Design a protein around this ligand. Structure first.
Ligand SMILES: *Cc1c(COP(=O)(O)O)cnc(C)c1O
Ligand SMILES: *Cc1c(COP(=O)(O)O)cnc(C)c1O
Ligand SMILES: [Cl-]
Ligand SMILES: [Cl-]
Ligand SMILES: [Cl-]
Ligand SMILES: [Cl-]
Ligand SMILES: [Mg+2]
Ligand SMILES: [Mg+2]
Ligand SMILES: [Mg+2]
Ligand SMILES: [Mg+2]
Lengths: 360, 357
């Protein structure tokens, strides 16, 4: 077989055992002689999958008992509007920390619904770093403080999270959820599209402190209330059953390999392969991120000019690498190295990078 | 070994060829050595599938060029709010025809957002029929007229559709889309969750007259966002759209919408003839002139017998026959991919149960 190295940024590589499991039972799930895709969401077989996906997330992230796990449709992008629709009430402020383009998109949706503020930002310097928490400008009437833990386009990531007492801390963790241990009780809400570290596209995981969001909000459509989904255990309407089943299968693989602590060790090792290659290149490759903010999930870099960027990306494509072109808004290169990307893909990328440099 | 007959009401049976195809290439789609689930949605590999799904829908339903085909998340239930959010503007009315519970759920969401009206309703007679179109109460300032083509819980279905000129006709076709030919030009918008006739759950198809379709609406909740971006504004439900493509290829291979309608008419006939020849042992909920070809609703003469029948069916491998909780009785869902042999098996079980009663 031709060699293929999957560095896609979203959707992305899945752990092969989760896919092989799904393949084997695609036509006959749990001895029912039906696919999981053909079952009722009120069947015992599906209810067991739904519940197991929650229980695995709870165990793996050590989610406290006063938080609920929601499985919603619409992507992280729908959460950009659902969050302020539920929490940005008259007289309060949706306060945002801007660390990339995804932060900006979240802010934009809140501005349509109420007052907003920028607590801190590295926009002026093209999002090369996470701002120091001492810079954060907080308001007594903040409805929440929103952060983006991993800035997928820019290749930067929070190393730790601020202690916020005056309003709930909310995080878009789409591109680094369950890549490392997390202290969930620092947050009022965490959300993530599944299609980077958890599963395929079509479900969004929302971890919510129940008493923050379990109350009706007057005038919000039924489907757009967190309370609807909390009360119905994410079964208010028909869920994305195959996406939640695949999420379950991915979480079983994370657990089998040793959980969040083990996957962080793996992720640190594979990121270091690529960062060391950059750092050893005497400026032939230049990372976008400041070293103290380097993402473990998305490695962003450029060559010395756009002609070399093009030549490198063309060679990479010829050699079987998929997905390395930077996001269209910024150019350059982006190696996405989510949980399931194998370490031999990273070794292969290092070898490509060394050879291209030496032959230039 | 075990015989299983899948009469689930949603999600539901899929075509064996579509599932077998998906299984075979689950790890290696189109020689990429990746699953379709592992592709970027901005890849040519995914974009080809996305476009093919749209193209097959256009071909099979004969959707004119002045309509757009959207693939959205959130189910039909999110459309209950997204439609009025976009079209129910100040001074206009969201006018509803009530033919079942799903019609009521749609009306409920419009009421939160603006003025609503009931053009006609068969609620008072327990939704046994579709109202005569001459009874429709229409308003000059209607933003739209909303119908539910197939009333999934009640087992009734529009035989044809009204000619509406004063405002766009909008239909929740979740439980009968692409079960028969349609004249799409009758409508301003059609929507359907995929999980009955088109594919697995997680994608919703919206067919919209492009000139139909907003200040202050969130980006994700504007139809315009998805029209302009070809349903690629954010990450789509890629596997669900791939499966939709596979289902549409199966429909096309069987001869299209007329061929599927003939199959569906034959399946429904088996069940209704069994009811009608039963000397009152089985009774349909629907008036004969409004009977659905998609969901056949019926009861036995008392609740103990209903429970006995449903227990026997479950024992013999039938899945999904319990009626919706809100009405009780029995419901045989016979969407496109439910095979005729399952309908024959249900008949034979119904005849034996009556004989042994
Ligand atoms: C990809 C991405 C999103 C958008 O997710 P969708 O599921 O496409 O709406 C939001 N936030 C981050 C950090 C992302 O990487
Ligand atoms: C099942 C159904 C719905 C609800 O669909 P979801 O995808 O669960 O939101 C709406 N309308 C009809 C006619 C249905 O049958
Ligand atoms: Cl970003
Ligand atoms: Cl991105
Ligand atoms: Cl109904
Ligand atoms: Cl239903
Ligand atoms: Mg295990
Ligand atoms: Mg290997
Ligand atoms: Mg009826
Ligand atoms: Mg006859």
């Amino acid at each position: 077989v031709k060699q293929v190295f999957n560095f896609n940024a979203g959707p992305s590589a899945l752990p092969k055992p989760a896919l092989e499991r799904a393949q084997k039972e695609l036509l006959n799930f749990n001895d029912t002689q039906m696919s999981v895709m053909e079952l009722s969401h009120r069947s015992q077989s599906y209810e067991e999958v739904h519940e197991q996906a929650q229980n695995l997330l709870r165990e793996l992230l050590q989610i406290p008992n006063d938080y609920q796990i929601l499985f919603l449709q619409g992507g992280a992008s729908l959460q950009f509007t659902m969050l302020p629709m539920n929490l940005l009430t008259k007289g309060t402020i949706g306060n945002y920390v801007l660390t990339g383009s995804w932060s900006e998109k979240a802010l934009k949706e809140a501005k349509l619904l109420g007052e907003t503020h920028i607590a801190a930002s590295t926009k002026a310097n093209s999002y090369q770093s996470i701002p120091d928490f001492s810079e954060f400008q907080l308001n007594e009437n903040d409805a929440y403080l929103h952060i983006t833990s991993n800035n997928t386009i820019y290749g930067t990531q929070y190393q730790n999270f601020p202690e916020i007492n005056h309003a709930p801390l909310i995080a878009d963790m789409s591109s680094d959820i369950l890549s490392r241990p997390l202290k969930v009780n620092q947050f009022g809400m965490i959300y993530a599209g599944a299609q980077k570290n958890l599963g395929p596209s079509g479900v969004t995981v929302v971890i919510v402190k129940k008493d923050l969001l379990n109350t009706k909000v007057e005038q919000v459509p039924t489907m757009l209330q967190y309370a609807t989904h909390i009360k119905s255990d994410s079964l208010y309407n028909t869920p994305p059953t195959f996406s939640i089943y695949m999420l379950r299968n991915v979480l079983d693989w994370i657990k089998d390999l040793g959980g969040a602590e083990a996957i962080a060790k793996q992720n640190e090792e594979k990121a270091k392969i690529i960062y060391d290659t950059i750092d050893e290149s005497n400026g032939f490759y230049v990372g976008h991120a400041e070293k103290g903010s380097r993402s473990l999930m998305n490695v962003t870099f450029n060559l010395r000019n756009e002609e070399l960027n093009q030549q490198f990306l063309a060679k990479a494509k010829e050699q079987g690498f998929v997905g390395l072109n930077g996001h269209r808004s910024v150019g350059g290169c982006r190696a996405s190295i989510y949980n399931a990307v194998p370490i031999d893909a990273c070794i292969a990328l290092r070898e490509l990078m060394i050879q291209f440099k030496e032959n230039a």
